[model samples]
Target: AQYEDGKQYTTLEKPVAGAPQVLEFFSFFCPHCYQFEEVLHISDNVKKKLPEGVKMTKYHVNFMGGDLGKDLTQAWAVAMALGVEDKVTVPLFEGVQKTQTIRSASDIRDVFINAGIKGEEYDAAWNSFVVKSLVAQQEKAAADVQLRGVPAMFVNGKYQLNPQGMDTSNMDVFVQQYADTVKYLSEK
Candidate 1:
């Protein structure tokens, strides 16, 4: 996606705390993103090897097919806004990848429940002001950024352009190298 400087490219008001930030952009429906899940786990293991204060956060991109994509994207934004990001994000991923479920707001709620998030709390959070705000924000972000595909990674604000144009044969190496590159960037 094309990023606009003042809009889609605003800097974090506070630099990520405790570690240099690694932002990964992924989509639930993308096959490549599903493949990259293994890489992400490996990257998590590698992060544990870091000296200290290093961290990663994932931002899911959901501008693929149609209503399903739109709904999933909004739900993701709602999860982030409601502060249940830790509770819902991974489960959303698993639900999509394993069940091949078509993700909508209700489906996301189901995933949250399955993942042990309390149903009443989920309902409250889902309908809360924060979630509403986040859904709007996520829609704006998707439109403003013009995201093209899934599995995009950004170190700080710099896009991981190398993998965007590569073929499947080269993707594994590109992903590994991307992780290495982010690690190096974080250290520097």
Candidate 2:
């Protein structure tokens, strides 16, 4: 999906507070999101040019109404809680599309363990109450947005990117539209 610089977004009645935030709402199992991340590398690309004081948040969506979505959501929440999302996201995503290796929390634990997290360390964080709480909060973040689909974008709580409405079919163009929209919102 692509958005035009000056005309492709909705105006927020009252923008959400805090430093400029580019929220990426995704479902790991969604093929479009898989392509967006693994194929186009959209997040990493835009992140490179994020102006100072602006940040991005990857929020997992559980709108699938089943365990697969919930499990991956919890899996990512655990990574976030451990401050390892930067390292785990791509590799975990690789497992999702390439190896078909992630199914349960235990599968995610092994992925982290192989990535250098000590076995005991993974065990502690995996079942900790804090991680559980974080999972709940992250789930709510998605719901709060009334998420309708994966690969949706929200910039500074405004400029919601309706992927299907934007112009362009090229992923490169898609990334630019996303970044351009974020850049536009950040400056406002």
Candidate 3:
């Protein structure tokens, strides 16, 4: 049995190293990504179905909010470095796209501060070399994949999911199919 390439998932021309992981390219400013996070709960549902040892990684797209987009990417990078993404990712998304209360890097910084990360510690991680490198890597990875939009996913760093091929008529079916595709690609 052969799964259709380019229909379900397209192979990357330059695949990143790491397997059994889903690399999500999204932005806090993206409306669709917000819907996925809040309305659809895509990541949470998918997590329940993922194969053991397979994990999902996120890359905040740096091209969406102009200078602020890059700042958002840095914020997300700092969150990852501090192991606080689980705490801040959704609130950041809601603040950015839902209630629309966030503006400027300082506002983004406040989210982390409120997440119980000390402001000084958040500032340190936000300015750390490691977080800077992670931000740079995310931009490079987006370019490597020739990403033109947000809420994209690459499974095992090789198979890029094509939402166009999925049955999006129902949200329930859509998410299940999405998780199924991810499970299928994690092995390849």
2 or 3, which is superior by lDDT? Answer: 3
The TM-score that candidate 2 achieves is 0.85
For residues 59-174, could you state the per-residue lDDT of candidate 2 as single tens digits? Answer: 78776537767877777777887888877887777777678888776777778888888888767876788878878877666655666678877787756765555556776876
Candidate 2: clashing pairs of residues = none
* lDDT of every predicted structure (CA atoms): 0.58, 0.73, 0.85
Task: Supply candidate 2's per-residue lDDT for 116.
Answer: 82
Query: What TM-score fits each model?
Result: 0.66, 0.85, 0.93
Error of 3 at 153 (Å): 0.4
lDDT of 2: 0.73
Sort the predicted structures by lDDT, highest score first.
3, 2, 1
Runs off by more than 4 Å, candidate 2: 1-7, 12-20
Task: Report RMSD for candidate 1.
Answer: 6.9
Candidate 1 accuracy as TM-score: 0.66
**Model 3 C-alpha lDDT per residue in residues 1-188, reported as the tens digit of each score:** 44689777788888877533788888898989998888888888778888888878888987788888889999999988999889998789888887888889999988888889998899899889999899888988887777889798888767888878888889999898887888888876
Better of 2 and 3 by TM-score: 3
| Candidate closest to the true structure, highest lDDT | 3
lDDT of 1 by residue, 62-139 (tens): 566567766676667666665676666566767777776745667767887787768887777667877667666544
Residue-pair clashes per candidate: 1, 0, 0
